Amino acid sequence: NLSFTDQHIKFWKKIPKQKAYSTVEQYGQLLDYGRSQGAFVGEGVLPDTNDS
Amino acid sequence: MLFKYIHDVNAKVEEGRRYLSDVVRVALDKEETTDPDTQEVTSTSYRVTAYPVVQVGEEEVPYIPVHPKTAEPGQKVTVPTYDVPEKLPVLVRGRNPEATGDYDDHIWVTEEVEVRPLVDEVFKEDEFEKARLYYENVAAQLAEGDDIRHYYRKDLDREAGHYSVSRYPSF
Numbered sequence: 001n002l003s004f005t006d007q008h009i010k011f012w013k014k015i016p017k018q019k020a021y022s023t024v025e026q027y028g029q030l031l032d033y034g035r036s037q038g039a040f041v042g043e044g045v046l047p048d049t050n051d052s
Numbered sequence: 053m054l055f056k057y058i059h060d061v062n063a064k065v066e067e068g069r070r071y072l073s074d075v076v077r078v079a080l081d082k083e084e085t086t087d088p089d090t091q092e093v094t095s096t097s098y099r100v101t102a103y104p105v106v107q108v109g110e111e112e113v114p115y116i117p118v119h120p121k122t123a124e125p126g127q128k129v130t131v132p133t134y135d136v137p138e139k140l141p142v143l144v145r146g147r148n149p150e151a152t153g154d155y156d157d158h159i160w161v162t163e164e165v166e167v168r169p170l171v172d173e174v175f176k177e178d179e180f181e182k183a184r185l186y187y188e189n190v191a192a193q194l195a196e197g198d199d200i201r202h203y204y205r206k207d208l209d210r211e212a213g214h215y216s217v218s219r220y221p222s223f
Binding site for chain 1: 155158160
């Protein structure tokens with residue numbers, strides 16, 4: 001044999017493998033913990049709301 | 053404006069779509085319908101309204117001290133002036149049309165919407181006391197620290213106990 005063999009494959013044996021159950025695979029990401037809108041409010045004042 | 057009242061609402065009230073500003077004004081004024089031919093009143097009414105206002109300037113008014121304080125004979129104080137704005141801003145979720153990846157896709161955008169009165173009622177000339185009670189009730193509701201919730205009026209309601217009319221769908 002003058003060509004490569006099994007031991008020359010590196011990335012295919014290193015990437016983790018997971019089982020698929022459909023032709024479309026979905027996943028969810030978290031991007032932010034909230035909007036940057038200022039944290040100081042004052043004495044006895046209800047602070048504003050925020051959303052991630 | 054025979055009566056006028058300025059109230060500062062909290063952050064929870066300001067978040068609503070009906071209270072996009074931070075200051076609410078409650079007024080009571082009298083309207084007259086004049087004869088087009090000669091100056092002669094034909095009908096009179098009282099109106100109770102409520103608008104979210106914004107500050108436009110300042111003016112000087114006489115000082116009225118409270119119990120702990122005392123005022124000079126000619127002391128004056130400066131208070132702001134308010135006006136009804138045409139539009140007010142909102143913040144709503146959006147998406148970037150030209151996002152290059154997964155980190156700049158979801159954003160927040162600002163829009164302008166029309167401003168509508170919070171309260172708008174009409175009372176007749178011979179019903180001044182009822183208008184005064186309604187105005188006081190609105191002021192008390194605003195003072196309670198929440199949204200205006202009670203708009204009920206006994207005069208404009210349909211009859212009760214008339215089962216042949218109230219059986220129709222109303223949802």
